[PDB]
Design a protein around this nucleic acid. Structure first.
Ligand code: DGT
Ligand code: CL
Ligand code: MG
Ligand code: NA
Ligand code: NA
Ligand code: NA
Length: 326
DNA sequence: CCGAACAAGCATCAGC
DNA sequence: GCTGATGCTT
DNA sequence: TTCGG
């Protein structure tokens, strides 16, 4: 991490704008600048050198100059001293609490973890589980544990129905040595863009993973998206493992390639690629890539038989998952 | 200067 | 109940 | 906050 100091500052600014100012485009600007700088293979010596990078503008170059000169950013130092900003930033670290709820809680005087714990009755279900596992969800997952989790998920899925295909995506598929959570893409031949021939396809999998005590809690659940909590089993007299966030996404079987591109990410990579798609005259979601008409309206889905097919449409060279961590 | 900035599932709420 | 907007999340 | 046009 050549420029870790700069990218930390930009990320802290990103988080301030999202959580406190509720300024989504400022948030995206700082996040993109941090991503482009994190990829940059030289130690940055000035804001002017940084300003040559796409996504670093005048204002960010000035902050980089102040940071390189002093090691600090005065703007951030004040933000950390502001109690309301500090408390709002803190509360958004609970899963289910965003900037609106965080500011509403602070208004009601709920400003600390203890404050939250004694006010469980003011939390919705998602927020309540996020508070329950607050510390655990802060811990990263070593890839060695990701492998054990993969093995459990893929084998339990096979026991429900041998025609399910479960793929672990996210940072795991990009080869990361540690992950924030586990992301499972799920397909079954009975669920295509053309019909749903069996009900409960996601439910059956969730229920099986609950039965074997792998899934421990649910944050949200519908017919195609599950967001929840899981935990590896531990040996006799060993510590328990931390509880972990798990997302499962059932995708139409014929739309796997758009689905695995979406769920492999990164999130910034997806934003970058979807923005370039638009400039090339296409729109990409997790299901399809479609041409944009002369008006702007999305046309019919184009045929896709590999992830690389999607890169070709927008005239991008293919990038392996490992080169998509932006 | 100024408009666009990725795309969408689930939970929750207001209004009907 | 349903529809649409908003929050929060991937 | 940044960029393209
Ligand atoms: N198009 C789009 N996709 C997103 C967005 N956020 C997340 N995703 C997709 C790409 C992610 O790689 C993938 C999983 O979301 P995660 O939050 O788990 O990110 P990821 O696994 O990459 O990193 P992690 O190690 O879990 O912190 O979902 C988004 O804002 N837009
Ligand atoms: Cl903004
Ligand atoms: Mg993940
Ligand atoms: Na630039
Ligand atoms: Na949060
Ligand atoms: Na995830």
């Amino acid at each position: 991490t050549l420029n870790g100091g700069i990218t930390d500052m930009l990320t802290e600014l990103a988080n301030f704008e999202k959580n406190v100012s509720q300024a989504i485009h400022k948030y995206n600007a700082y996040r993109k600048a941090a991503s482009v700088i994190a990829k940059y293979p030289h130690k940055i010596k000035s804001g002017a050198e940084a300003k040559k990078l796409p996504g670093v503008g005048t204002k960010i170059a000035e902050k980089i100059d102040e940071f390189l000169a002093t090691g600090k950013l005065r703007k951030l130092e004040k933000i950390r001293q502001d109690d309301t900003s500090s408390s709002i930033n803190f509360l958004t670290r609970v899963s289910g609490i965003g900037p609106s709820a965080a500011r509403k809680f602070v208004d009601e005087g709920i400003k600390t973890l203890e404050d939250l714990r004694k006010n469980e009755d003011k939390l919705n279900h998602h927020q309540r589980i996020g508070l329950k596992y607050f510390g655990d969800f802060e811990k990263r997952i070593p890839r060695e544990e990701m492998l054990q989790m993969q093995d459990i998920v893929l084998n339990e899925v096979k026991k429900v129905d041998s025609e399910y295909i479960a793929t672990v995506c996210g940072s795991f598929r990009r080869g990361a040595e540690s992950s924030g959570d586990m992301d499972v893409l799920l397909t079954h031949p009975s669920f295509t863009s053309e019909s749903t021939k069996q009900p409960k396809l996601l439910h059956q999998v969730v229920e099986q993973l609950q039965k074997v005590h792998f899934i421990t809690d649910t944050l949200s659940k519908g017919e195609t998206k599950f967001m929840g909590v899981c935990q590896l089993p531990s040996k006799n007299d060993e510590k328990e493992y931390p509880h972990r966030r798990i997302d499962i996404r059932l995708i139409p079987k014929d739309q796997y390639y758009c689905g695995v591109l979406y769920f492999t990410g990164s999130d910034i990579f997806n934003k970058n690629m979807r923005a370039h798609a638009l400039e090339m005259g296409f729109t990409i979601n997790e299901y399809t890539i479609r041409p944009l008409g002369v008006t702007g309206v999305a046309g019919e889905p184009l045929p896709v038989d590999s992830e690389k097919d999607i890169f070709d449409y927008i005239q991008w060279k293919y990038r392996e998952p490992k080169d998509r961590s932006e």
